[PDB]
Design a binder for this molecule. Sequence first.
Ligand code: ATP
Length: 382
Amino acid sequence: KGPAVGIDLGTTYSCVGVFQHGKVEIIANDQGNRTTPSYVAFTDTERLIGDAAKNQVAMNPTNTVFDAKRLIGRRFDDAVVQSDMKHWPFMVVNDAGRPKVQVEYKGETKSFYPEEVSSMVLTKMKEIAEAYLGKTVTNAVVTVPAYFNDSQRQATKDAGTIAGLNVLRIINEPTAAAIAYGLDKKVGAERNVLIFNLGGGTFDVSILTIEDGIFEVKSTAGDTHLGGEDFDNRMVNHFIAEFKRKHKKDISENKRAVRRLRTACERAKRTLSSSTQASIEIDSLYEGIDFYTSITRARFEELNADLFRGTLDPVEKALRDAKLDKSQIHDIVLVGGSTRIPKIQKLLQDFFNGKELNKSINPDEAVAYGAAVQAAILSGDK
Ligand SMILES: Nc1ncnc2c1ncn2[C@@H]1O[C@H](COP(=O)(O)OP(=O)(O)OP(=O)(O)O)[C@@H](O)[C@H]1O
C-alpha cells in the first residue's frame, strides 16, 4: 500500500501532511519550508513551481501565475473573475465561457485552465511527500473552503485527478482544523466551535456545531480580499514614503524595487511576531542606493490597526447569523499564517473575554494536519 496524504491547497501557500504511527508529519519541501507557495512560473527553459517560482516573480511578472484558487471552477463572466483579473499581472482569457490563464513558455504562447495550474501545485506537494516517504503517493484528501459550491469542488477534485492523485474525499477547511484538535471526538453533547482563519489573501470565520462527530456549519463570514498580503502592503507604502523622504526619490514607478521591498517586508513581518523590531537591508534598492532601516512591532501594529480591528466585525456577524452568544461557543481555533500576529491574538481573546485560544499546532499547518488524519481513517490506517 501507500499512505494517503492530507493536502491543504491554499490561495497563497499549500501544505502536505501524513499520518504515521499515530502522529501527523507535516512534510518540509526542498528548501526545508513546511509550507510552499501556490506559485507557478513559465520561462524560456522551464516550468518552475513553488518556492522557485515565487523566488523569481520580480523578473517574470507576466509569466508567473498565482491566485488560481480564485479562478478554479468559476466562469469568465463571473463578477468575481472580472474584478480580480484587473490586478493580476498575467493574462486571463475566455475560452467558451471558461477562463484561462495565458503565458509564454519557451517562446510559445500557451494557456491553461485554473485546474491545470492547481494540478501543478498538487504535483509538487505529491513529490514532496513521495520524497519524504520514499514511496509513491496515490491517495489524498484535499481541502476546500466551506463556501465552495459544487463547481469549485468539482474543479478541485479534477485538479487532483490530473496530478495523478486519487482524491479520497474533499472536506472543508473548517472541519479539517477541528479534526486536527480532536474536537470531533464524540462527547455527550453539542459543541460549538469557532474557526478563525486568516491566511495570505483570504479571511474566513466559521462556526461549527459538532454532535456525535457530525459537523454542521451554522454560519460563515469573512472577507475574500483581506490577508497577510494586505499587511505587507501597509509596510511597503510606509517604506516608499520613508525612502522618498530620506532620498527624495520615489520608487513607486520601479516595479522591481517595490517587489523586492515587499519581499523584505513580508519577512520582517514574520520576525515581528516573535521580536519587537526587525531590520530591512536591501542592497541597491533604487539606483545604487542601498536601503537600510527597521520597523518596530509597535509601528507595525499601528500601520495595520484598522485592518486588525475590523477583523472583529465578521466575528460579530457570524455569531448573530448562527444565533449564538460569545458564551455559547466552546472552542476557538486559529488557522492561517496571519493568526501568529500577537495583536490579532490579543484582539480576539479580548473579544471572547479572556477565553483561551487553540493554537499549539502551527496555524498554517492545521488544515493539512486534519486532512492527513481524515485520510488515514478513510484509508483504513486509523
Ligand atoms: N509569523 C508570522 N507572522 C505573520 N504572518 C505570518 C507568519 N508566518 C507566516 N505568515 C503569513 O501567513 C500568510 C500565509 O498564510 P497561510 O500559509 O495560512 O495561507 P493560505 O492558506 O495559503 O492562504 P489563504 O488564506 O490566502 O488561502 C502570509 O501572509 C505569510 O506572510
